[PDB]
Amino acid sequence: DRATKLLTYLADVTVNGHPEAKDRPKPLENARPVVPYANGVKDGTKQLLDTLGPKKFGEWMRNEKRVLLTDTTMRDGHQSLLATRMRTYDIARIAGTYSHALPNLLSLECWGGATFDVSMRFLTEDPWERLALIREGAPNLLLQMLLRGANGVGYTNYPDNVVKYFVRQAAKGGIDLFRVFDCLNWVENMRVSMDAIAEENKLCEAAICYTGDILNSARPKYDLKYYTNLAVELEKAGAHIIAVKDMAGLLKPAAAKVLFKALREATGLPIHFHTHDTSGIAAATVLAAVEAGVDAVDAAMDALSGNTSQPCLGSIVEALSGSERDPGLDPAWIRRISFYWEAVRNQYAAFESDLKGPASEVYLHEMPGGQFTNLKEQARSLGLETRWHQVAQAYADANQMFGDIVKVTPSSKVVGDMALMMVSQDLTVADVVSPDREVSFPESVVSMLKGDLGQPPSGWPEALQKKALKEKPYTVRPGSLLKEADLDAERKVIEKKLEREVSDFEFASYLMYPKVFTDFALASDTYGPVSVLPTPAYFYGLADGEELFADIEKGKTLVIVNQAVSATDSQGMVTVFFELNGQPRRIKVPDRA
C-alpha cells in the first residue's frame, strides 16, 4: 500500500499529464543522470563549527587566506533558472558526491528562498525530507539557508513567536548557516531573527542588500557609508558573519574593490559576497571582491550558472587556481558534478525561460535575478510580452516613485505588481501620484504602504501614501503590533483537519503556509512518497514497455513496469497495467480531458 499509492500517481500522470508540464516543452527523447563513482569523508566546516561555535567560526573564516566557496546550485541556481522546480530526488542523489569530492566547500545553499513553498505546492514533496536527506548525504559540510528576515520563507512579516518557532525547527532540521536579510535593510526588523539564530547556536550571517551604485556621486542615498554603517549595526546586533547580497547583480568590479576594503575596515567580522550574473560580468565583480580580501563567495555549478543565476563556479575557481587565495577545489570534480547537473537540468526543459544572455538593462531596472523570469511570466500572462521593455522602465519609474528602495523578496514583488499595473492601465508616475486620476492598487502595495513590510530610510513619500490607503499608516515594527499566535491552539486546527498528530516540523510548514501545507498533506495520503520517483516519472509517467526502479524504504527497491493501458471506460476510468516485482497490478484512474 505504500506501493499501490505511488502506482495510482504514476497511472494518473501517465494518462492525464502533469499540470505544470501539460503544455510546456518536452525534453529530448535522448541521457539520464549518473551519480559519479567515488573511501570515507574528510571532516569539514561542519565539524569545525561544532568544535568552535559560531562566534569563533566566523573568526576562523576571517583569518583564512584562501577564499571560501558556497555552492548555490541546490537553491538560488534553480530558483533563478528553473522556477525553483528542482526536485529532492536529484538534489539528494548528488550530496554524497559533494561530501566526498569537494570537502573544503564552506557550505551548500540548499534551502529557504522559494524552495520551502514550491517543494510542497508544485513538486508534491516535503522540504524537511529534502533537508534531512542532504544532511545524511553531506555530514561534513555546512548546510546554508536563505531566510527572509521577518518574512521567514513567506511573503509577509509574521508574528515573532512564529519567526522564533520556525528558526528553532530549521536548526533541528539540519541548518547550520542562516543567511538572513530584510527587504528594506531595516535592522530593527532583523533582531528577532538574529537573536533566534544565536539561541540555536548556529551561524547568523546578517546580510546587507546592495542596490544603486556607490561610485555614482549623483545617487548618494546608497553611498559607501550606508553600507559600512549597516555593517557596524549588524555586528552590534550579534552577527557572526556579514553578507553583501547583490540580489540583482548590480555591484560592478571597481565598486567591489572599494566596498570590500571599506567593509573589512568597518568591522572585524568575516564578509560573504553573494551576487547574480544577469549583467554577464558578475564574475569580474566576484574576482575583484576576492582581490579585496572578501572572506567567502557564492557561485553555482557551471551547468546552472550564468544569466540570472550566480556566476560560474568552475571558471571562478579556475581563475583563482594557483594564486595566494586559491580555494583548493579539484577542477575535475567540479566538472564531473557539473556534467551531472547538466543531465539533471535537461529533465526540467518544461521550466526553461527564453533568456538568451547577458543584459546591461539590469542596471536600469534592478529586477532581482530570481524574479526576472517570474515577472516575464506574469506579463505574458497579462498579455504584455510585446511591451516588456516598457515593463522594465515602469519598474524603475515605479521604484523611484517609492523614493528609491531595496528591491528584494517581497518588496521586489510589490514593485513588480505596480509596474504591471502601470503598463496595462497606461499610467505615468505623475498620473499615479495625481489627485484627480482614479486607480485601484494591488493589495500588495496597500500592504507595504501602510507599513506591513517595514520602513525605508526617510520613510514612505507622504503623497503616494495618502492615496493608496484611502487607513492610517503605522511606522513601528510590524510584529511589535502583530499578536502572538497561540501555538497550542493553531495546532489543534491542523490536527482536527488532517485527523492526525503531525510533526513539530509539519507544524512549522503550517504556520508559514496554512493552505499550501494543508493541500500538500492531503496529496501525500493519496499518492504517497512521490519524492522517491525519478524526475521524468514524476513529470510524465511511464511510457509503454518502460521499466522503472524506485526505493520506497532504504534498501527496498521496487521494479515497476508499465505493460499496458486501456481505452477510457463507460464509467470514465482508465486502467493501467503494471508488473511490480513480477506481480501484476491493475490501477484504475479517471480521465480529466
**Under rule CB under 8 A, residue 570 binds a second copy:** yes
Residue tagged active-site, from 71, 76, 246, 404: 76
Q: Which of 356, 470, 496, 515 binds Cl ion (CB under 5 A)?
A: 515
Q: Which of 41, 59, 60, 64 binds Mg ion (CB under 5 A)?
A: 64
Least distance to Zn ion, CB of residue 245, Å: 7
Q: Which of 33, 103, 149, 314 binds a second copy (CB under 8 A)?
A: 314
In a 10 Å sphere around its CB, with 0-12 CB exposed, 13-18 middle and 19+ buried, how is residue 280 labelled?
middle
Q: Known catalytic residue: 298?
A: no
**Under rule CB under 5 A, residue 514 binds Cl ion:** yes
Q: What is the dihedral of CA 484, 459, 473, 196, to 10 degrees?
A: 0
In the bound state with Mg ion, the residue whose beta carbon lies nearer, of 248 and 317, is: 317
How far apart are alpha carbons 474 and 476 in whole angstroms? 6
Judge whether 277 is annotated as a binding position: no
**Cis previous bond, 410, omega within 30:** yes
The dihedrals phi and psi of 139, each to the nearest 5 degrees, come to -80, 0
Terminal alpha carbon distance of the chain? 28
Helix (H) or strand (E) holding 178, with range, is: strand 177-180
Q: In what order do the strands lie in the sheet with 556-565?
A: 547-553, 556-565, 573-580, 583-590
* Segment contacting Zn ion by CB under 5 A, of 21-29, 71-79, 88-96, 345-353: 71-79
Residue tagged active-site, from 46, 202, 245, 376: 245
Name residues whose C-beta falls within 8 Å of residue 140's C-beta, 6 or more positions apart in sequence.
41, 42, 43, 44, 45, 46, 47, 99, 103
* Segment contacting a second copy by CB under 8 A, of 381-389, 442-450, 499-507, 516-524: 381-389
DSSP 586: E
Least distance to a second copy, CB of residue 569, Å: 6
| Residue 112 β-bridge partners | 146
Site for a second copy in 5-44 (CB under 8 A): 30-31
The dihedrals phi and psi of 426, each to the nearest 5 degrees, come to 45, 60
Q: Known catalytic residue: 12?
A: no
In the bound state with Mg ion, the residue whose beta carbon lies nearer, of 295 and 366, is: 295
**Under rule CB under 8 A, residue 360 binds a second copy:** yes
**Under rule CB under 5 A, residue 125 binds Zn ion:** no
**Under rule CB under 5 A, residue 291 binds Mg ion:** no
Judge whether 75 is annotated as a binding position: yes
How far apart are alpha carbons 219 and 337 in whole angstroms? 42
Query: Which of a second copy, Cl ion, Zn ion, none does 513 bind, CB closer than 5 to 8 A by kind?
Result: Cl ion
Q: Which of 36, 238, 293, 358 binds a second copy (CB under 8 A)?
A: 358
Q: Could you give the string, one character per residue 8-47, with x where binding to Mg ion holds by CB under 5 A and - elsewhere?
A: ----------------------------------------
Query: Which of Cl ion, a second copy, Zn ion, none does 451 bind, CB closer than 5 to 8 A by kind?
Result: none
Q: 208 is written with which cell numbers? A: 546587507
Q: 460 is written with which cell numbers? A: 514612505
Site for a second copy in 258-297 (CB under 8 A): 277, 279-281, 283-284, 287
Q: Known catalytic residue: 172?
A: no
How far, rounded to the nearest angstrom, does the alpha carbon of residue 474 sit from its chain's CA centroid? 30
Query: Which of a second copy, Mg ion, Cl ion, none does 215 bind, CB closer than 5 to 8 A by kind?
Result: a second copy
How many helices (H) and strands (E) in the chain?
24, 12
Runs of H (alpha helix) within 312-442 = 313-320, 331-346, 362-365, 369-381, 388-401, 411-424, 429-432
How far apart are alpha carbons 526 and 325 in whole angstroms? 53
Q: Which of 121, 335, 585, 588 binds a second copy (CB under 8 A)?
A: 335
For strand 107-112 and strand 68-71, is the pairing parallel, antiparallel, or unpaired? parallel
Q: Which of 569, 572, 591, 592 binds a second copy (CB under 8 A)?
A: 569
For strand 556-565 and strand 573-580, is the pairing parallel, antiparallel, or unpaired? antiparallel
Query: Which of Mg ion, a second copy, Zn ion, none does 76 bind, CB closer than 5 to 8 A by kind?
Result: Zn ion
How far apart are alpha carbons 144 and 205 in whole angstroms? 10
In a 10 Å sphere around its CB, with 0-12 CB exposed, 13-18 middle and 19+ buried, how is residue 354 labelled?
exposed
In the bound state with a second copy, the residue whose beta carbon lies nearer, of 239 and 289, is: 289
How far apart are alpha carbons 536 and 32 in whole angstroms? 9
The dihedrals phi and psi of 583, each to the nearest 5 degrees, come to -130, 115
Judge whether 573 is annotated as a binding position: no
* Segment contacting a second copy by CB under 8 A, of 180-188, 225-233, 350-358, 483-491: 350-358
**Under rule CB under 5 A, residue 76 binds Zn ion:** yes
Judge whether 466 is annotated as a binding position: no
**Under rule CB under 8 A, residue 229 binds a second copy:** no
Name residues whose C-beta falls within 8 Å of residue 31's C-beta, 6 or more positions apart in sequence.
343, 346
Binding site for Mg(2+), by residue number, is 61-62, 64, 295
Binding site, by residue number, is 1-3, 61-62, 64, 75-76, 79, 148, 245, 274, 276, 295, 409
Q: Which residues bind Zn ion (CB under 5 A)?
A: 76
Q: Which residues bind a second copy (CB under 8 A)?
A: 30-31, 215-216, 252-254, 277, 279-281, 283-284, 287, 302-307, 309, 311-319, 322-323, 331, 334-335, 338-339, 342, 345, 356-364, 385-386, 389, 544-545, 563-567, 569-570, 575, 577, 584, 586
Q: Which residues bind Cl ion (CB under 5 A)?
A: 513-516
Q: Which residues bind Mg ion (CB under 5 A)?
A: 64, 295
Binding site for 3-hydroxypyruvate, by residue number, is 75, 79, 148, 409
Task: Report, as residue numbers or ranges, the catalytic residues.
Answer: 76, 245, 409
